[PDB]
């Protein structure tokens, strides 16, 4: 049972730069790459006293990639994986999908080919990218397209980073986001949205760090992913693999967008503070003050929820907890499903990273649900997309690259169809 992880764009490989640091520490691998069977799902044992990740960083600008090449993880991250282009897509979906994709995607998927042939029990792929940028959106969609036509039946777990409504670093993010979803809809099987402003508020409120950088963000992103694959990496009382989300969380072939959350995101002094048990973290996983997307789940009705439990938990109290949640009436469910839960329990507690701001906790919960607040998110992005598109702003860059208005309009009405789909299902 093995799963490979590809990273697209500037944000994706920074996430991976934190993720694999967490992985090698969790499996006791020094950054040079050797230990002083559970690792087999991420690391292949070459020769003697060496392990190499099942991953490929890829990006168009060489700055961030060769910073990985020269950093502390020279020996661990292997030479061929780190694919780097010569020049950026420059926040231009057309430039990252039609000009430079045509030269880089074949080299990438030919690497993925020999990676899958090295693997034996491939569970699925999982991609890391942000759709606001050019490289993450454009060749990310192009790659996912060629991965779908090549394998198709294998699960594809897409952990995307959407632009925040009020916090924004770029300008053409609406154009690139919409053009990303136009392919993300019919290519990814299981796609999890993670905003930035929510993580800012989480680090501000619970972690009480006044001045956070991207490092702490990516640190807790790795915590979430590691807590999601812990069921495969280690045995538990009730294990749940990568194919179960495919079944238990996606009621329709076009409704796959999952809100994720994590608990307890706590500081060092506050672990000393509070008495921790299952009931309060099961609660705190449902407040919007602890979700990974800046959206209000009270505005929406849940479709299905999944609960990853790590550490020292029995099935008794977690079953009692979800009982209290199901009988609470602050939050409601759809009338379509009576049993809207999918639990999972693993024995190994979450590990800590030196320099990280989380305390070592006895037990933690990773929630992944499905709601209609996402349907509100896409409308919020759609509104500011049409505001800019109405004046034909910035269109000449994409047209000069070689695209037209047809895919603009059809992606616009494609999101409109997605809006209608959500409004119909939520009823």
């Amino acid at each position: 049972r093995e799963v490979i992880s590809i990273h697209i764009g500037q944000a994706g490989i920074q996430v991976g730069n934190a993720c694999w640091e967490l992985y090698c520490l969790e499996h006791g691998i020094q950054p040079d790459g050797q230990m002083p069977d559970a690792f087999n799902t991420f690391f292949s044992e070459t020769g003697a006293g060496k392990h190499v990740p099942r991953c490929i960083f890829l990006d168009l600008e060489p700055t961030v990639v060769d910073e990985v090449r020269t950093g502390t993880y020279r020996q661990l991250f292997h030479p061929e994986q780190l694919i780097s282009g010569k020049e950026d897509a420059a926040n231009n979906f057309a430039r990252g999908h039609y000009t430079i994709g045509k030269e880089i995607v074949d080299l990438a998927l030919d690497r993925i080919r020999k990676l899958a042939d090295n693997c034996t029990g491939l569970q699925g792929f999982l991609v890391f990218n942000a759709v606001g940028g050019g490289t993450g959106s454009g060749l990310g969609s192009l790659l996912l397209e060629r991965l779908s036509v090549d394998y198709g039946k294998k699960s594809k777990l897409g952990f995307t980073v959407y632009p925040s409504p009020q916090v924004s670093t770029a300008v053409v993010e609406p154009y690139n986001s919409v053009l990303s979803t136009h392919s993300l809809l019919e290519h990814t099987d299981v796609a999890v949205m993670l905003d930035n402003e929510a993580i800012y508020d989480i680090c501000r409120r619970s972690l009480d760090i006044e001045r956070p950088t991207y490092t702490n963000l990516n640190r807790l992103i790795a915590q979430v992913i590691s807590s999601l694959t812990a069921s495969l990496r280690f045995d538990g009382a009730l294990n749940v693999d990568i194919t179960e989300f495919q079944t238990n969380l996606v009621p329709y072939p076009r409704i796959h967008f999952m809100l994720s959350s994590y608990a307890p995101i706590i500081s060092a002094e506050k672990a000393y503070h509070e008495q921790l048990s299952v009931a309060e973290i099961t609660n705190a996983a449902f407040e919007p003050a602890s979700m990974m997307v800046k959206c209000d789940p009270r505005h929406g009705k849940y479709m299905a929820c999944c609960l990853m439990y790590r550490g020292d938990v029995v099935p008794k109290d977690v079953n009692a907890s979800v009982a209290t949640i199901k009988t609470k009436r602050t939050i409601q469910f759809v009338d379509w499903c009576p049993t809207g839960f999918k639990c999972g329990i693993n024995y190994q507690p979450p590990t800590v990273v030196p320099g990280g701001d989380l305390a070592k906790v006895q037990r933690a919960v990773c929630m992944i649900s499905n709601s209609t607040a996402i349907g509100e998110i896409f409308s919020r992005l759609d509104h500011k997309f049409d505001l800019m598109y109405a004046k034909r702003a910035f269109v000449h860059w994409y047209v000069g690259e070689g695209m037209e208005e047809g895919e603009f309009s059809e992606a616009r009405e494609d999101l409109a169809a997605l809006e209608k789909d959500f409004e119909e299902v939520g009823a």
Binding site: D296, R298, H299, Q332
Partner: protein
Amino acid sequence: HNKQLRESINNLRRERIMFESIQSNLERELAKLKRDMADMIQQANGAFEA
């Protein structure tokens, strides 16, 4: 500041929506239960007369 207050009000109203919906569902279930109550009364009367 006006926009902040407006957003807060909008949130409050959108939660009021959820509250009235769950109220409606609970009322449906309560009506079904009182129907069951009346049925049990009728069954008891029948057994007593028998």
